[PDB]
Amino acid sequence: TFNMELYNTDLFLVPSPGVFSVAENEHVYVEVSVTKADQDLGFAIQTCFISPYSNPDRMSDYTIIENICPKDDSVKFYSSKRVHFPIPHAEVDKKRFSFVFKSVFNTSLLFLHCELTLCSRNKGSQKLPKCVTPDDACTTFTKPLAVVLQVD
Secondary structure, eight states: OEEEEEESSTTOOSBOSSSEEEOTTOEEEEEEEEEESOSSEEEEEEEEEEESSSOSSSOOSOEEEETTEEOSTTOEEEEEEEEEETTTTEEEEEEEEEEEOOOOSSSSEEEEEEEEEEEESSSSOSSSOBOOOTTTTTOOOEEEEEEEEEEO
């Protein structure tokens, strides 16, 4: 129901076939996606950080996005993409951003941890947070996802 894809270009055409290889100073194109029936339901990208653990309890000082705000300055957002399944009555909501990688760990095997927050895409709604955009954000309904990175 939730996805996280890495791509080699800002066309998000061709996802990497497992473990993404990355060197300092390169871009990484992330795509996150929610697949759902409700059409009032959106999401935002709450937090993203790199870390050498498959574990997020040991969070990390390498934070890219925090409370929907871009903390790393290399970060760019791209158009979001709602794509309809006609016959299954479904919608994939996708969001996209890049950043420039910096190696700073003591190891070559890393994790991109992103967490999605679900939210309500229509005004007047106790039931979940209304929705908000990334620099608008600079001014339980949350899902953790991890993808693997390989430094060279």
